Amino acid sequence: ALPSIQLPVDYNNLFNEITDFLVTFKQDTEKGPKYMAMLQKVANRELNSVIIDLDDILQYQNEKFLQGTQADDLVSAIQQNANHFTELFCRAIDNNMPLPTKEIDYKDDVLDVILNQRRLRNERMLFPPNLTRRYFLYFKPLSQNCARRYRKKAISSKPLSVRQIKGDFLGQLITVRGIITRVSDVKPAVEVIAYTCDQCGYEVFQEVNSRTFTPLSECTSEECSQNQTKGQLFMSTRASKFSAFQECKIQELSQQVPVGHIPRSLNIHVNGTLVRSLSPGDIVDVTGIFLPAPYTGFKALKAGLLTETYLEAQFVRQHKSLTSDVEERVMELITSGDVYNRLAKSIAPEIYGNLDVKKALLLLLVGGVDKRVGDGMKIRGDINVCLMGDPGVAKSQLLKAICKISPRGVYTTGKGSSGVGLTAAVMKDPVTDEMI
Amino acid sequence: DAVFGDRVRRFQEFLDTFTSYRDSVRSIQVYNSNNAANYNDDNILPHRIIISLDDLREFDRSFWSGILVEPAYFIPPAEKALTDLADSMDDVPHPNASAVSSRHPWKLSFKGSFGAHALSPRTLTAQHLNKLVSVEGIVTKTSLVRPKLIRSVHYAAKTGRFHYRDYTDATTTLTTRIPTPAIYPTEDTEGNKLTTEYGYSTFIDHQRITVQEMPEMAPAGQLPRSIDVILDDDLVDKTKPGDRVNVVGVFKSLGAGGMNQSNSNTLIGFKTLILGNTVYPLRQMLTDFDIRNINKLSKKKDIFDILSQSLAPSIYGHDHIKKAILLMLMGGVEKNLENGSHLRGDINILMVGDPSTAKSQLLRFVLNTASLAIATTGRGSSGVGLTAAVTTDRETGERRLEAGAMVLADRGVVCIDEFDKMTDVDRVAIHEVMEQQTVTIAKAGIHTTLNARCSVIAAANPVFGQYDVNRDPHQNIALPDSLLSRFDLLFVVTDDINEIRDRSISEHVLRTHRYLPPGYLEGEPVRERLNLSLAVGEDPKLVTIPFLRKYVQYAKERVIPQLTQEAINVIVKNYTDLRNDDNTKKSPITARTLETLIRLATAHAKVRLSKTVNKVDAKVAANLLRFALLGED
Ligand SMILES: Nc1ncnc2c1ncn2[C@@H]1O[C@H](COP(=O)(O)OP(=O)(O)OP(=O)(O)O)[C@@H](O)[C@H]1O
Ligand SMILES: Nc1ncnc2c1ncn2[C@@H]1O[C@H](COP(=O)(O)OP(=O)(O)OP(=O)(O)O)[C@@H](O)[C@H]1O
Ligand SMILES: [Mg+2]
Ligand SMILES: [Mg+2]
Ligand SMILES: [Zn+2]
């Protein structure tokens, strides 16, 4: 049948150490445990996310080493395998959840009403725990500073590329540096599905751990055990638990591509409160778990043993107003004096000359009055500046440079691409094949 | 069974007979071991050795014959013995968290003489199946790298033990076995739920490349043929399209071949593939003798003249163009500047001239002598064929991009012939590549910027049959001004009738046409066929071409000169003198001439193997550009 192999890791001692770390850990630098404070904060319906730090876990390991008792190197176990430790930590959080200390505040929560209505009928006359959960659990990659402080090296936070991601890193926690190109809308993904049964017993719950599932449509309760054909199950959306899901694509930076090659791309999946952290056009450093997609359905047979892949995201590090500060900056620049000439001159300091052109580009940067006259008359305040002249006079640096100053600007060129008049009403977007 | 163990014993004896392989195993092992111990690191060598078939031939003729003739029954026994030896060497323990599950077995590679097993994608037939072969060719297409599952590990609750399932495929192993459905087990033998534990399983990278025959060796009236090679593990991404490669592997059949439930048909045959063991590129490593000779030849005063004259010794004259080509070979230093800009370091040359003036025989020479070169013809090219094309990946199913001529020659040269005969829609694309050195693709949901840093040498003809001196230069050349501004040196060459020139050039041509290759008799036709013997062993003064290639490589990779003030003083005076004069030049002078002087000075500085730009470099650049623009020679 299925042969058996011996592996050093045992999850019992790991669970014991997680339980010890949640209670014992204190920030050495409020007093007391670091995480039981934020758990109490969560219990008051205020915090929606729980973020664990592996620097903190190393701190607990270092405390135990100061005591001298052996440890299970939890930090390495998390790095090598992280899809199971999420469930372990969720169970550990569920076991030690503090009581609501203040402001219970039950107002109109449908799930709350359902759960409260369950109690009376069940007691007067076991469900999946994830239904009662609200917090989301995320890991935080290691820090080189803390690592160098205690050696031990580091692998999870190293800024790899899309190309350096081999098949040997699957099932681990890694970090990838790139630029975000495409981001999709937020849609709900089912986690626990509740079916209502023709006043037969009560609603049944099923968990979904894949991208594809099958409805139950058969009532198995004790009262529903009667033989008469009676009807299948109907889904109830209100008693079911959903989640926010988003998918993005990250592309390799031009600096890291070798000569003669084409850049690759990677897929990122994000669930929870971390959704909407990434937008198109951002250069970011994303940490997560690298997992194999099932690739099932059609065109799975031809591949046979070939799989897709994706990255479950858990952390985001983006590389890069009226206040008294900006109220004083303008006064400082006024006291500086020579605003006109200096403003014109500092525009593209590489190019020497054409100072009147630089004066006019300033006037183009500012806008004239747009006054809406009655009876339909309108007058424009925008500026139309054309610059003619012989080739090789710095024609096309001046322009590009002006685009930098104003955020709202587009550099459109000749017939290589059609963007000036592309006010088209048809868009064959591959995702859905409908017009936009 | 017994034969397997006997062959393992034979290979084990072979391994301790020759101690070199045992030393290489230890070197790789100690490197990998002491690399992981460097916590303050500044990467991992694969488990693969290269053995020579020759030594095995003297050791055991039977085993060598078995490997060459019946690889599928002699390679797996050898790999197990190599793994056993490697395991015996590693005395130090490695109680790693997850390396215990994945052993990464050692593999083998071959070299030496293959005899009659050295073939090409055309001479490979059904007689060579299940044999060890080597094929020479050019890579055309590659597939995307995907991960493939080899072993899955599952954890069982209520018991605490693990269970593993193994997977095999036709392309994975050399022996046919019962296939696997690649579905993860969900139920234990006792019915306990099983949970898949990624991070303990095994995945291997997989790629497929296509190797085509060299078009120069094809028979008359026939198109070149191609074959498919599958690469795995550590052989991935060692080749790129356009490369010339030699792949050693096992020629194998696959599938059912229409002898099955499907209808009987004469059009259905079997599918053939190669499981590549080794890939060899057909970078010239330099010894100390070569470097010492280069440094000794650098100090000679008239080195630029010798280097320029050594180019194309079968062309009479055209000294200045040959100097310009040499300066192209040793490009300038590229400067990365703020605002996301870069000053180009490439030198671009255009040649306009009369018919039969040896314009096209210099492009062909540049194709051969340079490290990377791509040939293009005006009328037989398209815009989508120069920048990139949207295609599909059959093996995996996505939509991808395929490189064109310009982007395939990154850090190389592109030689375009009949440049004026190119259509306008075609000529816009080359404009962008000449200006930004980048390609923008915004088609079919693929939004990408591609790097293309190539040097352009081009040849064209005037509007009429021959150059006219009684008409303005712009009337003679049909090319637009915007395109014409992007060339550093424009050379107008004219054939003038003179008796002494004719007497010399006719003598030179007649001397050239009377050359006999060594080993050929008079009247014996040249047998440019090689008789299917592709290779014997499978892996005033002028200078020889390979020495020139070594010189160019060393100069490009070892010296980066910087500009100096005293050279700038010469450059500025030359620019000011040239700008303010009434001489009628064949091309207008603009503010981009200064950059051309700087680039030519940098190239001449590289030629001298020096780290600074001197006054002599500025003088040489000035003389070259004065000849180009004026003809004052
Ligand atoms: N006043 C100036 N100051 C500095 N550089 C200048 C000046 N005038 C021209 N240049 C030079 O001109 C170049 C910038 O303009 P460039 O010739 O590339 O484009 P353009 O004027 O749009 O012409 P084209 O028609 O060739 O595209 C640089 O080499 C720059 O050094
Ligand atoms: N200077 C020369 N030295 C040696 N051979 C020459 C020379 N000039 C021309 N030839 C010979 O003339 C023939 C044609 O030359 P080639 O094809 O290079 O001309 P071209 O400039 O490309 O012509 P076209 O304008 O017709 O395209 C070749 O056989 C070449 O060897
Ligand atoms: Mg311009
Ligand atoms: Mg020609
Ligand atoms: Zn019922």
Q: For tokens 């915007």, what's the residue?
A: B482
C-to-N gaps above 2.5 Å in chain A, after residues = 29, 125, 320
Cβ distance A63 to A7 under 8 Å?
no
Name the residue among B205, B80, B101 with its Cα closest to residue B152. B101
Q: Which of B359, B315, B583, B592 is nearest to B467 (CA)?
A: B359
Beta-strand ranges (E) seen in B214-286 are 226-232, 244-254, 271-281
Residue nearest to atom 3 of ligand 1 (CA): A351
φ, ψ of residue B16 in degrees (nearest 5): -85, -10
Of the candidates A83, A166, A400, the beta carbon closest to that of B198 is on A83
- Integer CA distances (angstroms), A203 to A217, A220, A234, B377, in order: 12, 11, 10, 74
**Contact criterion met (CB below 8 Å) for B106 and B86:** yes
Helices (H), A282-422: 300-303, 324-336, 339-346, 355-365, 395-405
Among A252, A255, A262, A405, most B C-beta atoms within 10 A, so best to mutate, is: A262
Task: With CB atoms and an 8 Å threshold, state whether B160 touches A11.
Answer: yes
For chain A, state the CA radius of gyration: 30
CA distance B387 to B409: 11
**What are the structure tokens assigned to A148, written together?**
């160098």
**For chain B, how far is it from start to end, CA to CA, in angstroms?**
83
Residues of chain B with C-beta less than 8 angstroms from the C-beta of A170 = 147, 198-199, 201, 203
Under an 8 A CB cutoff, do A259 and B95 touch? no
A vs B: CB pairs below 8 A = 151
How far away, in angstroms, is A231 Cα from ligand 5 center?
8
Resolution expressed in Å: 3.4
Cβ separation of A260 and B182 shorter than 8 Å?
no
CA angle (B166, B167, B171) in 5-degree steps: 145
Q: Estimate to the nearest angstrom the gap between the alpha carbon of B87 and the chain centroid.
A: 37
SS (H, E, C) B410-432: CCEEEEEECHHHCCHHHHHHHHH
Upper half-sphere CA count for residue B460 (Cβ side, 13 Å): 23
| Residues B103 and B47: beta-carbon distance below 8 Å | no
Return all residues near B4 (Cβ < 8 A) that are at least 6 apart.
Answer: B77
Q: Which residues 18-37 of chain A have a CB within 8 Å of chain B?
A: none
For the record, the structure tokens of B414 come out as 């592109």
**Annotated binding site of B, which residues?**
353-360
Question: Are A167 and B204 in contact (CB < 8 Å)?
Answer: yes
B377 pocket-lining for ligand 2 (C-beta < 6 Å): no
Q: Is residue B220 within 8 angstroms of chain A, CB to CB?
A: no
Of B323, B305, B412, B405, nearest to B362 by C-alpha is B323
Contact B75, B38 (CB under 8 A): no
Q: Give residue numbers after which chain B breaks (C–N above 2.5 Å).
A: 42, 282, 539
Which residues sit with their C-beta closer than 6 Å to ligand 1? A 351-353, 391-397; B 482, 485, 591-592, 595
Nearest to A77 by CA among A65, A90, A88: A88
CA distances to B382, B414, B550 from A414, rounded to whole Å, are 19, 25, 43
Instruction: Report residue B399: phi and psi, to 5°.
Output: -105, 130
